[model samples]
Target chain A: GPGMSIDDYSLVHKNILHSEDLLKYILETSAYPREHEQLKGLREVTEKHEWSSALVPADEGLFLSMLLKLMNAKRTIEIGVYTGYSLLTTALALPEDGKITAIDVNKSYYEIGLPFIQKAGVEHKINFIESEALPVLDQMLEEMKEEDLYDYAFVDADKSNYANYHERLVKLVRIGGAILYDNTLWYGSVAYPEYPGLHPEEEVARLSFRNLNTFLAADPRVEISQVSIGDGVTICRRLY
Target chain B: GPGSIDDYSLVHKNILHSEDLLKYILETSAYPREHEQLKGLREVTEKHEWSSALVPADEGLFLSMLLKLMNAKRTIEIGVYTGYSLLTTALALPEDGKITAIDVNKSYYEIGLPFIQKAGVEHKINFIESEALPVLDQMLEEMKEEDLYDYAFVDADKSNYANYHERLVKLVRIGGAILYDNTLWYGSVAYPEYPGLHPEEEVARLSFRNLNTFLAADPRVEISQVSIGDGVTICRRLY
Candidate 1:
């Protein structure tokens, strides 16, 4: 349980003296132990690629697992597989026949994650692709193929092109599938003033995240919730 | 032979919003709905007398339901006269079962619950007007009792909770059964201004202490304090 009563996230986050939300998030996921082993492997593979925060939050892991289970989602995709914690979670929950079409621009980052994936024994289930994704996405859209469509998609990529990636993602994810946007709150920077009375440069990037937040909220094609678990995740449930 | 991704997108017509999805997740649980019913029941009972708090409904429901899910059919209900909780447990059970319901004052409960005769499974219950501990000791004395019970719902005299527990542990079968029914005396268990000059509150505070000490020393069960309706401790026998 999230510890606060049902439908009381806002009140619990604001009023509760001891935040069980954060505590539950930490305890529920097998993050620290898994991340510890893979971090060293990543250091060797990428040779210092600023590979921290590769570990996804545990609450998000549980939520993802539950959603996939509920949707009976089998064909899925992960845009950024970093150290593969989210990938690990997704793969673990899916049916044995289920598959993950994983994409990352850097093969080296994926290299650091291979040992753990192999250790978890889901390496065979993942179809890893290395390339800038725009070309592959464009090809999938032109083909109009059901097998090309994914049941769920996790997006974590270049901050500037989120809307562009999302435009293509909307075409690729199936009707009942979910699209989870990681770092959606951008470290609470999304709420910062666009034209601040204080710092101007600090406000510029904040304005970008804020604009994306508004864009996602206003989009009628999908239903959304900006959930605060680790950084904040925006979950979009597609509606035709 | 593949239909286009655009065609598959047609299925999204009935997709729910994220808030609605979260709501769907919660409504699947029985506890929240049961809490709402208990809340209304508590208000109704409160208008009549102070004795209703003698045993909280949610505490009774929580312990009994959890044990029922674990499939405990044979139950020992201490102080079970008119049987609000005895009725709850009996309703959750199968018809071929029974509960040994012990109480000193049979006349007290019989007045309020007139529908006891109308109940479909009243024959499954055994009501006794005797001391709880003696019955428990007698059960202990007779090793091969008629049948072993899987749970015990104790809400008898608050002062005798410790005495009842001592005999309860010996009689209840190993790796089966528990004792519950409003252990968390209102919110008085943790409240310090205790005697804050109120004798009744003091009695509740002392009852909580007796319950806590007995629960701590009891090596027979594994316990968890769950704050559901009032506050209930769910004890599962380990030995």
Candidate 2:
């Protein structure tokens, strides 16, 4: 009965984002009207997809918005756009002229969040490109001068390429810019491997997430904070 | 075998700030040497009766990082328990930076004074032995320096949080931050029926909880709560 609802699991009961009651309390106290609607709309679209777990929790999105304002980030990028929840959050957080380049392998999922983004009046801020993520990143890198890099980048796609994404993202974002990696914990699998079967997927899938966690922990180029929020988001601020 | 120990009932277990895991995380991250000194002070404080109240390393790390990220110069800290966070904030800020450190009782703070002086950052801190609210009032009325403070940390008497916030919102500059410590109340604030065990502590915890709800709806500042050490509520001035 405790784990019956989507809120229970989505709130990440065991980790730093624990306690569904607490999560609900936070939301009740801090209402983001359009973010709430986009979250609800995405859930409706993903009812059958089941892969909806890819969507970051609302708290994490709220954290992103705060960080964006804190840094005064105007140019940003998102690697994955499932239902465009995070993209919309980023778009809303940036200034009026703030720009975000959102890339996904498909656009169907983004369609569900398009109207919500439009209603939020941040649709003009996003440049949606449906393609393989890495190539798009490479193309953008080639065309841009050193002064024209992004202020922030969010990598939430294809966990297998996280290490690769880190390599490129670190360079693409200016010095002191932030690059965030989602799902570093993979539920409880990464830290407490003894408690098995949590993510009983292909061996490589588990390994990919595990390796990135290890890599980012030791990474010296950026000061790191492995915040145990929303499936474990690791924040790496590029120093070089 | 573990049943005899009351470790299971510790507040860290119920709250988001899990004990060993949180400890391990702070150790693993990149922290400056001064941060280590303040942490050592915490260890000494832990042996005393007031051990339950120290600012955990996770929240300290978050605050330190934010200070650096914002490049904040002038800061204000209330409830300087052994100066753990005051030192941490000092370490994060730049040279010639200043902090107005407040505490009602001076004896408790003296315990950590040597450590702060040892860190050689003592010159950066202006220790004030007085009540926080009056200082804030004087700052608002006497100084009339609207939006002079870049950052403010409230870890003092929780009952006066709402009052502090009303005054602080005016003092913190636009895009600057005001951090309220212990908004989660070690998870007691979430569950309504759970008594805080200590009578006065219970009242303070509930007050903070109510403040958070009020802040969520307040148009003056944008807010986000991180369930880090003891649970911190971060508010950025919108106006």
Candidate 3:
């Protein structure tokens, strides 16, 4: 019952320590196949976006891949198939028994990255749908109110409907399921006064940001962490 | 495609309607300097520690402060290496609130106490030296007499983390809080062939393995692993 004394022999001295090669070794040892490598590939692609600071693709990729692998995810769903990075990450995490239902509005950009998903050898793992996300989600929810559910869902589509996407996602994904909302930071636009639509870019960004804040703070269905990583990703773990 | 089709109109039909758009128009715009402060704190902590593993000080501060913001009066911490995190939690708490911090050393805590006390939050902290498992048991007993903790943080000895967690789940109140640090383990949890890892580091690695494993399996709490500050796995007890 030595609960009152600190063990002086412990190795790491500070509350924080540097990442050493050992940390890398430990991470590699724990990683599922091709997770980090695929992230590197995705990051390379994310760099091409015009407002580069607005997109933080890595942390989400890393977060979701780990979640999929951890959950032993057999079924997954993703909204906003930007460049197919998340789709690829989700696909790779699926058990051969698993699959992902991916939705996106722009078939053009998705095709550009289709090869990467193909390269991941998870091409068979995805059922890619080309359409605006909400209808697809709502239809599924109604048909499968009893089932047809997902273990996890990632939202990264249009900034305007984040809350809308979020409401449906909360239903479509099961209890204890996770829904990750990306770009919650809104390129730092939402935190400032409205520009009266001057910067259409900032306008949408601001809206998404404000919406996410309200959605997260008020929602009792899931516990959330509005973490600022890669344009900010808010995680909600639904508990019914 | 057949399965993917849901009544999308239910979620989509009026989402962008003028009323919602107008509501957005009236909502005041605000982004906190705390985010930048948090970023700067993480940067400084990383630079000062020379390790990328320091959870962002902002996150450390926020996790603990959020506990206070929730009116958390009882807290348990499994790691107290230099007390930066403990300090964060302690500072954000009320005067009568207490943090039961467990670690393996006192001297290091002593070294940090000057900074901790100087911050004037030391009154809320009770730093203990021991293997955390047994102390958690004692705390469990105490909870029966007093009350379950409002929050708990697991960051110390990774090997016994699941053991610590087994107790924490019961000791925290329903809808109460817990945040497990190092869930990402400096991204080590993602890589398989990591280098320079200690025997205990390997044990620490497995701790995360089991941590993630537990997070998925435990239905007592709803959990989300956020990647900010070295991947924090937060659990709010549901029952």
lDDT for each of the candidates? 0.58, 0.76, 0.63
Best by lDDT: 2
Q: How far in Å is the alpha carbon of B145 misplaced in model 3? A: 32
Clashing pairs in 2: none
Ranking by TM-score: 2, 3, 1
Q: Of models 1 and 3, which has the larger TM-score?
A: 3
What's the lDDT for residue B87 in model 2?
A: 84
Q: After superposition, how far is residue A153 of candidate 3 from its true place, in Å?
A: 0.8
Q: Which stretches of candidate 1 lie over 4 Å from their true place?
A: A1-240, B1-51, B54-61, B143-146, B196-200
Give the per-residue lDDT of model 2 (tens digit) for B124-156: 999999999999888888654553889999999
* CA deviation > 4 Å runs, candidate 2: A1-18, A31-49, A200-210, B1-13, B17-24, B30-34, B144-147
lDDT of 1 at B112: 30
Q: Cα lDDT for residue A212, model 1?
A: 67
What does DockQ give for each predicted structure? Answer: 0.03, 0.38, 0.05
